[PDB]
Write a protein that binds this ligand. Structure first.
Ligand code: GT2
Ligand code: K
Ligand code: K
Ligand code: ZN
Length: 399
């Protein structure tokens, strides 16, 4: 079946942060208004049988002291009195500040996404589901002992760790506007988790990595050398050029790596209507949405797949994209056509889709360095396959 993570408590927690507000509710209610929920298997978030089992799961990646600080940060924000100087210094040492502030549910909110993405991995491992979707997950910037970019716990790293410990190889594909630095870093020394991020990069733009470092690309270390891939792209790119840029790379990686699982981060901040206003992708499904192109290509491999959310700050347009991604996944896996009306159906958040209440985002598209990146990346894939002694047809890949 196609699984999707949700639950009443889960929806409550995913909607409790100051930055992302009720985004997750809009996403799931649009999926519901288009009658997709009966097509999907509900995957409940993982719960644990003691505080010690919870800690053992989260500290598979994160340090115990970081977990301790994040839980203390929640407690402190549930009392009225403000922080002492010693507690502020403690939070500062884990970057629990500025872009990653505390709030009354910050720990349960962060943990919830971990619970969802670990349950999604389990449902793929036991073969209940061929694909699982978690639009509450995808928080790719969090590091072992540091919050970053409103990511407090790295649900993706923990999901991938569960997958690889079930020889298992995982291909991680990161479609967010931003470089997936936290996932890349976690698996920097690990050849069995190959990471590939396509993103904007330019001087001063967050988080800064995934690009030239004459400078060269770093790409892993130890036995993980050549196992971290990156494609940085200039601002203004449209669906067609983004699709051609990443399409051959995706197919080459699948052919050479032959992954046991694929994990996709599908942050929606590349949409032309995101307030970042950097890339110009759409949710269009005839100009074909770069996101839908990539997901369809990945699903055509027939490899068990985890699809996660991520960035996306125009909440109705994020709903519009992820609803179409969800219908596409049903069609590709079940072989059953999903027809989606071009008009938004009546439902509790209908008023949020004004002023025109259509499923297409409201955008009118327009519009050699990529050739050089393609040559560089193919060379790296050759180095990866040589180092790891893999068998593959150069002429099929070079094709
Ligand atoms: O999504 C992210 N990473 O995956 C991510 C990480 C760090 C930052 Cl600073 C941001 N940026 C924002 O939050 C933001 C920027 C401009 C505007 Cl107009 C509105 C917002 Cl909401 C996003
Ligand atoms: K990315
Ligand atoms: K790696
Ligand atoms: Zn982002």
């Amino acid at each position: 079946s196609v699984g999707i993570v949700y639950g009443d408590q889960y929806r409550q927690l995913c909607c409790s942060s100051p930055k992302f507000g009720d985004r997750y509710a809009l996403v799931m209610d649009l999926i519901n208004a288009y009658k997709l929920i009966p097509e999907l298997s509900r995957v409940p978030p993982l719960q644990w049988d003691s505080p010690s089992r919870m800690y053992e799961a989260v500290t598979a990646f994160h340090s115990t002291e970081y977990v301790d600080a994040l839980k203390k940060l929640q407690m402190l924000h549930c009392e009225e009195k403000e922080l002492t100087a010693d507690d502020e210094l403690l939070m500062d040492s884990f970057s629990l500040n500025y872009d990653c502030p505390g709030f009354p549910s910050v720990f349960d909110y962060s943990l919830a996404a971990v619970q969802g993405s670990l349950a999604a991995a389990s449902a793929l491992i036991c073969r209940h589901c061929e694909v699982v979707i978690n639009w509450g997950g995808g928080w790719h910037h969090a590091k072992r002992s540091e919050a970053s970019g409103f990511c407090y716990l790295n649900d993706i790293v923990l999901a991938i760790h569960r997958l690889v410990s079930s020889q298992t190889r995982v291909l991680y594909v990161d479609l967010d506007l931003h470089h997936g630095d936290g996932v890349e870093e976690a698996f920097w020394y690990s050849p069995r988790v190959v990471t590939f991020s396509v993103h904007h990069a330019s001087p001063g733009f967050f988080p800064g990595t995934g690009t030239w470092n004459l400078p060269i690309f770093l790409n892993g270390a130890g036995r993980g050398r050549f196992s971290a891939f990156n494609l940085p792209l200039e601002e203004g790119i449209n669906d067609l050029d983004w699709s051609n840029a990443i399409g051959p790379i995706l197919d080459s990686l699948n052919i050479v790596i032959q992954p046991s699982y694929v994990v996709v981060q599908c942050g929606a901040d590349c949409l032309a209507t995101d307030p970042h206003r950097i890339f110009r992708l759409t949710n269009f499904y005839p100009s074909l949405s770069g996101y839908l192109y990539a997901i369809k290509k990945i699903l055509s491999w027939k490899v068990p797949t985890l699809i996660l959310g991520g960035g996306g700050y125009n909440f109705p347009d994020t709903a519009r994209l992820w609803t179409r991604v969800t219908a596409l996944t049903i069609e590709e896996v079940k072989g059953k056509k999903m027809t989606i009306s071009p008009e938004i159906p009546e439902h509790s958040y209908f008023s949020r889709y004004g002023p025109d209440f259509e499923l297409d985002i409201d955008y009118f598209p327009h519009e050699d360095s990529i050739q050089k990146h393609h040559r560089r990346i193919l060379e790296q894939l050759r180095n990866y396959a040589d180092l790891n002694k893999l068998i593959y047809d150069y002429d099929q890949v070079y094709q």
